[PDB]
Structure 1
Amino acid sequence: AKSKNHTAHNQTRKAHRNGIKKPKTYKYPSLKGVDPKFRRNHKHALHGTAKALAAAKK
């Protein structure tokens, strides 16, 4: 009862039907795992500049 053990045969045929999807790319990617000290500050910085545009619409 032995059998084939392993093969890549036909696997790239398969990968290429639907395609090897190029990575897809966004403006504004996530900050996932970016330095928390930085982010904490970056948060208040943004709060700040936003305020100063609401302010510039007085």
Structure 2
Amino acid sequence: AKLKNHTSKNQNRKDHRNGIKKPKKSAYTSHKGMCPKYLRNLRRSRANDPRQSLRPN
């Protein structure tokens, strides 16, 4: 008793049913895989800037 092995017949219609979802607008600015030396320098420059430092007083 053999049954079907494979079909992609209806798959493109199912994909378009609710549109093709775009990624989130925060995935474009993640620090997920950035060079660590660059990230460390960015942190220290912000903290020492009086106009953008969040340190209290």
* Corresponding letter in the other structure for 1:9: K
Q: C-alpha deviations, 1:13-39, integer Å up to 9, x for none?
A: 10111111133434x711111001111
Higher RCO (CA-CA < 8 Å; seq separation 6+): 2
In structure 1, list runs of 5 or more residues that go unmatched: none
**Residue matched to 1:21:** 21
Identity of aligned residues (%): 53
- How many residue pairs get aligned? The number is 51
Counterparts of 1:40 and 1:24, CA distance in 2: 26
Structure that is richer in helix per residue: 1
